Design a protein around this ligand. Structure first.
Ligand SMILES: *[C@@H]1O[C@H](CO)[C@@H](O[C@@H]2O[C@H](CO)[C@@H](O)[C@H](O)[C@H]2NC(C)=O)[C@H](O)[C@H]1NC(C)=O
Ligand SMILES: *[C@@H]1O[C@H](CO)[C@@H](O[C@@H]2O[C@H](CO)[C@@H](O)[C@H](O)[C@H]2NC(C)=O)[C@H](O)[C@H]1NC(C)=O
Ligand SMILES: *[C@@H]1O[C@H](CO)[C@@H](O[C@@H]2O[C@H](CO)[C@@H](O)[C@H](O)[C@H]2NC(C)=O)[C@H](O)[C@H]1NC(C)=O
Ligand SMILES: *[C@@H]1O[C@H](CO)[C@@H](O)[C@H](O)[C@H]1NC(C)=O
Ligand SMILES: *[C@@H]1O[C@H](CO)[C@@H](O)[C@H](O)[C@H]1NC(C)=O
Ligand SMILES: *[C@@H]1O[C@H](CO)[C@@H](O)[C@H](O)[C@H]1NC(C)=O
Ligand SMILES: *[C@@H]1O[C@H](CO)[C@@H](O)[C@H](O)[C@H]1NC(C)=O
Ligand SMILES: *[C@@H]1O[C@H](CO)[C@@H](O)[C@H](O)[C@H]1NC(C)=O
Ligand SMILES: *[C@@H]1O[C@H](CO)[C@@H](O)[C@H](O)[C@H]1NC(C)=O
Lengths: 402, 118, 100, 50, 50
């Protein structure tokens, strides 16, 4: 059997898109720009423009709802105390920066700096300042209350004691924290610094958030470029067509142009619908991650980064969110010789919580995730049966604490 | 020898006058949608109009980032959002009775008491 | 043609199986740590509210049941009336679309 | 109250699709198959192909 | 495109199931078969997993 004897604290990163860009297109103005004859001819087609406008309005409302449900997770707004005696941990790299304007953390500033004719765009309902205020409220509430503020009314708790709770939540005794507070604090600070340095150094840090914008821009550009096609008509410009051709014959050309432009609009709207559905799925996943990972501690595997989950902090980003998962991982291990049970006087002793172990001369019992030998007594084992059923049982002596 | 400029998306945006050689800039004159903000007709019959993305010259006139708002009285308070408009501005029918446009309030201010012993 | 071949997929599945069998769940979180399989199964019982006495006294029965269940699964997988419908419907739909 | 006195070990299966067949259709060849006149006529529609 | 979206959703579900059920023990009910979960093993298949 192999048992670790040391641990490392690691911090990872996760990026998730949340919202798209709200856009609207005037069907009539796009198809026919200030042309009475073109408008009259288009009037004999139906409610296509109305359908497109309704779809786009639905998309915009869906984007607003997505952002609202992702970020508006807290009822009140909390504030960090002016003192910064968090048991030795240093949080200056994620808390809001008061000196610089707009009140954003340095990591948020680095994130923001990295991403840098009938068509209208609507402003988002929530502004960057409000998103930052939500993120700051969530961060301060987490830091000062653990999960109690998400469960119910907020209750204060010292940060070392909260970390002791978290260690107790993954099968490691709080003894370990109370012995290695300084090492754990140093590792946490170093990991935060490394994440800050590496994020700017790596070029493809926000590939998804850049890709969404690139796709939207390319779709808009090709839609606006499609306006300069003949579609089989004499010319692609309506005023010149009207000035050249006769009224009896210009109708065919105008009809061809209308058909082409309507087909282009329909294709664009369908693509927008599909992309919006994908973005909504991503936003739902991000909301679930936030709820189950920031406001609490989760036992699901690889749902909150690699390793055993401890805590995570949220950071805002343009049209997205960023998480900083903090995980526990064993580092340094040896191997020993184990045994399933122990014979004392014809009775079989089994571990209460732990596993038997020996270095070759004496037998002890430890935890499962950290080497810490203890002497074998009646407070570590419980008797069940006799010495004739278990396979591989081993002779030994069990001390009596009485 | 260049006559008229062009844009990245192939849009005419610069013309030189033939008689007097001089560079001119072309920008289309404003356009935008129109929206009506109303409570339930059962409650009242007074409405407000929001002119989208148009500058308050081409039309109690109030200016926002979303557009030019007509018929709503600005206030200093902050309430929960009722009828969203854009850029953190919401309007509601509140007391006498009229329509008011404000800045939405995220929530109640709070500060938990923290110390290394409590 | 797909980027990953069937032999590579089989290699991944074999690696996952060997890692699970010889390490429990330790290899998914950190470095792989060996552990006897009866002890790992004792931990698995301990995780659902059953003490280790049950396994350490019914090891033979549990092993026999495991082997019998595996054999039954293999027999059903062979002599079932087209249980692999989910992986066939996709191919049928794609073929119909291309044919149309 | 009822308390079990014996247990069984059961194994079940579960089938999930992962990927479909990669495919690609030549736009121009499908529409205007080896025809200069057809290609010239099609070139007036724009970016309905890329 | 519409079919590929569904296939991607199924693939994401399969990946989540693999990560949460093969590399560990899950307490979610009926997520890994009827009854109390112990362990699971993967098997490859044409365009799918078992
Ligand atoms: C457990 O690992 C930690 C590192 O994560 C060790 O701490 C290092 O110890 C060496 C030697 O004393 C120092 O030079 C390093 O500066 C320490 N690192 C830090 C971050 O302080 C620790 O010694 C290990 N413990 C055991 C028992 O091996
Ligand atoms: C928390 O970390 C910050 C840096 O991330 C520390 O600020 C540094 O303090 C040293 C010593 O005064 C200065 O030389 C650096 O220039 C500071 N860096 C920045 C970015 O301001 C801060 O001191 C740490 N917290 C504590 C309590 O020490
Ligand atoms: C296995 O652990 C035991 C317990 O510590 C070791 O026994 C001790 O050995 C040291 C010498 O290294 C003695 O000073 C102690 O008095 C011993 N303790 C007892 C209770 O006798 C044992 O040496 C370890 N095995 C090996 C190979 O190092
Ligand atoms: C396992 O034990 C053997 C002999 O006891 C030793 O040679 C080997 O280094 C051990 N494994 C590790 C990872 O230390
Ligand atoms: C471990 O296996 C070896 C070889 O099969 C066997 O000789 C030994 O007795 C086994 N260990 C126990 C405790 O039975
Ligand atoms: C364990 O102790 C019993 C007590 O008599 C003895 O019979 C048995 O042989 C011992 N086990 C071994 C492996 O010697
Ligand atoms: C056209 O005539 C006017 C009258 O003097 C003169 O000012 C102008 O420069 C002339 N245009 C050009 C291009 O020379
Ligand atoms: C908007 O209107 C104000 C008031 O006249 C004016 O100062 C400002 O320049 C206008 N902005 C634009 C972009 O026209
Ligand atoms: C606050 O009220 C004063 C007068 O009462 C007014 O001049 C000012 O514009 C108001 N500010 C806001 C943000 O409502």
């Amino acid at each position: 059997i192999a048992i670790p004897t040391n641990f490392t604290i690691s911090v990872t990163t996760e990026i998730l898109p949340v919202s798209m860009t709200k856009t609207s297109v005037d069907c009539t103005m796009y198809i026919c720009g200030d042309s009475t004859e073109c408008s009259n001819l288009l009037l004999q087609y139906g409610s296509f423009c109305t359908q497109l406008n309704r779809a786009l309005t639905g998309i915009a409302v869906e984007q607003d709802k997505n952002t609202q449900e992702v970020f508006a997770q807290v009822k009140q707004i909390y504030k960090t105390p002016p003192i910064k005696d968090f048991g030795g941990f240093n949080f200056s790299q994620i808390l809001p920066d008061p000196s610089k304007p707009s009140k954003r953390s340095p990591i948020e500033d680095l994130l923001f700096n990295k991403v840098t004719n009938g068509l209208t765009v609507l402003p988002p309902l929530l502004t960057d300042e409000m998103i930052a205020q939500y993120t700051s409220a969530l961060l301060a509430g987490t830091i000062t209350s653990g999960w109690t503020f998400g469960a119910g009314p907020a209750l204060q708790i010292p940060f070392p004691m909260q970390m002791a709770y978290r260690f107790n939540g993954i099968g490691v005794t709080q003894n370990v924290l109370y012995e290695n507070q300084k090492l754990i604090a140093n590792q946490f600070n170093s990991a935060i610094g490394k994440i800050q340095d590496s994020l700017s150094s790596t070029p493809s840090a926000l590939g998804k958030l850049q890709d969404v914008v690139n796709q939207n821009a390319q779709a808009l550009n090709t839609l606006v470029k499609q306006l300069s096609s003949n579609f089989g008509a004499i010319s692609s410009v309506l005023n010149d067509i009207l000035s050249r051709l006769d009224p009896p014959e210009a109708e065919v050309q105008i009809d061809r142009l209308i058909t082409g432009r309507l087909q282009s609009l329909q294709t664009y709207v369908t693509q927008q619908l599909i992309r919006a559905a994908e973005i909504r799925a991503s936003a739902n996943l991000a909301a679930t991650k936030m709820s189950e990972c920031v406001l609490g501690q989760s036992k699901r595997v690889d749902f909150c980064g690699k390793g055993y989950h401890l805590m995570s902090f949220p950071q805002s980003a343009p049209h997205g969110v960023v998480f900083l998962h903090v995980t526990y991982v064993p580092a340094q291990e040896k191997n020993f010789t184990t045994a399933p049970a122990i014979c004392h006087d014809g009775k079989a002793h089994f571990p209460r919580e732990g596993v038997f172990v020996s270095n070759g001369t004496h037998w002890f019992v430890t935890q499962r995730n950290f080497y810490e030998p203890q002497i074998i007594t009646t407070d570590n084992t419980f008797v069940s049966g006799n010495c004739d059923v278990v396979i591989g049982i081993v002779n030994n002596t069990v001390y009596d604490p009485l | 020898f260049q006559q008229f400029g062009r844009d990245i998306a192939d849009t005419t945006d610069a013309v030189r006058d033939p008689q007097t050689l001089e560079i001119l800039d072309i920008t289309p004159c404003s356009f935008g949608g129109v929206s009506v903000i109303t409570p339930g007709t059962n409650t009242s019959n007074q409405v407000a109009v929001l002119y989208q993305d148009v500058n308050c010259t081409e039309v109690n006139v109030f200016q926002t980032r979303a557009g030019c708002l007509i018929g709503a009285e600005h206030v200093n308070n902050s309430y929960e959002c009722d009828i969203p408009i854009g850029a953190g501005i919401c309007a509601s029918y509140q007391t006498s009775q009229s329509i008011i446009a404000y800045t939405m309030s995220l929530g109640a201010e709070n500060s938990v008491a923290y110390s290394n012993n409590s």
